[PDB]
Design an enzyme around this catalytic site. Structure first.
Site, short mmCIF file in Angstrom:
data_model
loop_
_atom_site.label_atom_id
_atom_site.label_comp_id
_atom_site.label_asym_id
_atom_site.label_seq_id
_atom_site.Cartn_x
_atom_site.Cartn_y
_atom_site.Cartn_z
N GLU A 35 -3.81 91.19 32.38
CA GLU A 35 -2.36 91.08 32.30
C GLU A 35 -1.91 89.62 32.43
OE1 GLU A 35 -0.03 93.11 31.45
OE2 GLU A 35 -1.04 95.09 31.46
N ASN A 46 8.58 90.61 25.55
CA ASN A 46 8.21 91.79 24.81
C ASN A 46 9.19 92.01 23.64
OD1 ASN A 46 6.20 92.47 26.95
ND2 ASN A 46 8.02 93.03 28.14
N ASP A 48 11.10 94.51 22.70
CA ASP A 48 12.37 95.15 23.03
C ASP A 48 13.40 94.26 23.74
OD1 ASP A 48 11.39 95.08 25.62
OD2 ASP A 48 11.49 97.28 25.94
N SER A 50 12.81 92.75 26.66
CA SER A 50 12.39 92.61 28.04
C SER A 50 11.32 91.53 28.12
CB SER A 50 11.86 93.94 28.57
OG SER A 50 10.65 94.28 27.95
N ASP A 52 7.82 90.49 30.79
CA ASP A 52 6.88 90.86 31.85
C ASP A 52 6.58 89.65 32.73
OD1 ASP A 52 6.73 93.43 30.71
OD2 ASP A 52 4.64 93.32 30.21
N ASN A 59 7.72 94.61 34.29
CA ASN A 59 8.68 94.59 33.21
C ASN A 59 10.14 94.59 33.65
OD1 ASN A 59 10.26 96.47 31.02
ND2 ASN A 59 8.82 95.05 30.08
#
Ligand SMILES: [Cl-]
Ligand SMILES: [Cl-]
Ligand SMILES: [Cl-]
Length: 129
Positions: A35, A46, A48, A50, A52, A59
């Site tokens: 990650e 991301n 959408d 958002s 991380d 998120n």
């Protein structure tokens, strides 16, 4: 802060992640490796809208607030920037909520694709712990 592998294992264990929701320590270390590459400062946008955040790439649509994510729920009740700290406490607390949300560690895409089903104990080999 970029954690060493055994350094992160020790921190995660101290914070009660080893065996949390039945996921052994190596699962958590492997998840963090893929990650964030063990980098507490990691951030990734991301598709959408958002982002991380941190060692466990938490998120901003569901879990933390970053002030710029449509539909944000902030279920961990924490600023996303607090999840970039050198102390992993806040990320651990929030990760405990995420892994309890119903789908276990499948919530971490990199865990699902790169750790799940593999020899995850290898991630704690050599560590005193
Ligand atoms: Cl393990
Ligand atoms: Cl820590
Ligand atoms: Cl599970």
């Amino acid at each position: 802060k970029v954690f060493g592998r055994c350094e992160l294992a020790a921190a995660m264990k101290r914070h009660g992640l080893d065996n949390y929701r039945g996921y052994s320590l190596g699962n958590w270390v492997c998840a963090a490796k893929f990650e964030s590459n063990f980098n507490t400062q990691a951030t990734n946008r991301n598709t959408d809208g958002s982002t991380d955040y941190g060692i466990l790439q938490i998120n901003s649509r569901w879990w933390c607030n970053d002030g710029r994510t449509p539909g944000s729920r902030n279920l961990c009740n924490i600023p996303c920037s607090a999840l970039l700290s050198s102390d992993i406490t806040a990320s651990v607390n929030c990760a405990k909520k995420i892994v309890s949300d119903g789908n276990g560690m499948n919530a971490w895409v990199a865990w699902r694709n790169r750790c799940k089903g593999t020899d995850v104990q290898a991630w704690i080999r050599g560590c005193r712990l």
